[model samples]
Target: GPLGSIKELKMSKDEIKREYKEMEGSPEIKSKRRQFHQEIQSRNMRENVKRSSVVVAN
Candidate 1:
């Protein structure tokens, strides 16, 4: 059988860009975003370490 519709067959690059936002842009840029999350978690764990008496280590 054949496919029904290929609606976006004539779609231009700019048109598709308008259709959807960046899929995480580029690698290193989004990697920095990931680092942003790690920094937050690191700060919170350090805070808990300060309040608590002890920590377990390997």
Candidate 2:
């Protein structure tokens, strides 16, 4: 996968720090990024639980 294909992966660590430094400049982008993270986390958690249940059943 391309490293910068999505918002979550777009910025380097320094870029992220600078972006956060100017809070007002990126409120919408930051919100969108947080939403992206939450969605990814939720999907990962669901997949893990499903895998765990299948392993337990077997």
Candidate 3:
């Protein structure tokens, strides 16, 4: 009897979730998202930075 070869196997829910977290934690992926978030935060920080500087100058 001959059976077909398995090219790939499916993962269970836990396995899939573990893999997903691993993928998310990769530096390449995490850094890009972090950069975008930091850019937005820096923009907001500038508003506060400007306000405080003006108050101190007065």
Candidate 4:
């Protein structure tokens, strides 16, 4: 009867992700992981600019 009346324990998606990232890693550096992402993003942006027709006016 007590078990039936008890509420289920469920965490929100954000709550789960927060705990998971905290334990797994929020931003522990290893082999330039963050740097690699920044490089990749910048490279992609450059590539996109090359592919697009845009005027660079300064």
Best-matching candidate per lDDT: 2
**Candidates' TM-scores?**
0.30, 0.34, 0.32, 0.31
- Expressed as tens digits, the lDDT of each residue in 1-58 for candidate 3 is 1232232333355678897798777778777899899888867845756654665544
Ranking by lDDT: 2, 3, 1, 4
lDDT of 2 at 27: 82
- Candidate 4, 1-58: lDDT as tens digits: 5654343333355677788787577356654697788877876756666545668534
Cα lDDT of model 1 by residue, 1-58, tens digit? 2232344454566678764555645466877899899978877856755555656453
lDDT, candidate 2, 1-35, per-residue tens: 66456755655666888977888686877888998
Q: Mark the regions of model 1 whose C-alpha exceeds 4 Å error after superposition.
A: 1-25, 45-58
Give the best candidate by TM-score. 2
Question: Against the hidden true structure, what lDDT does model 1 obtain?
Answer: 0.64
Error of 3 at 9 (Å): 42
- Clash pairs, candidate 3, are none
Ranked candidates, highest TM-score first: 2, 3, 4, 1
TM-score for candidate 2: 0.34
Location of the lowest summed lDDT over 10 successive residues in candidate 4: 4-13
Scored by CA lDDT, what does every candidate get? 0.64, 0.72, 0.66, 0.63
- Candidate 4 regions exceeding 4 Å error are 1-10, 13-21, 24-27, 30-32, 45-58
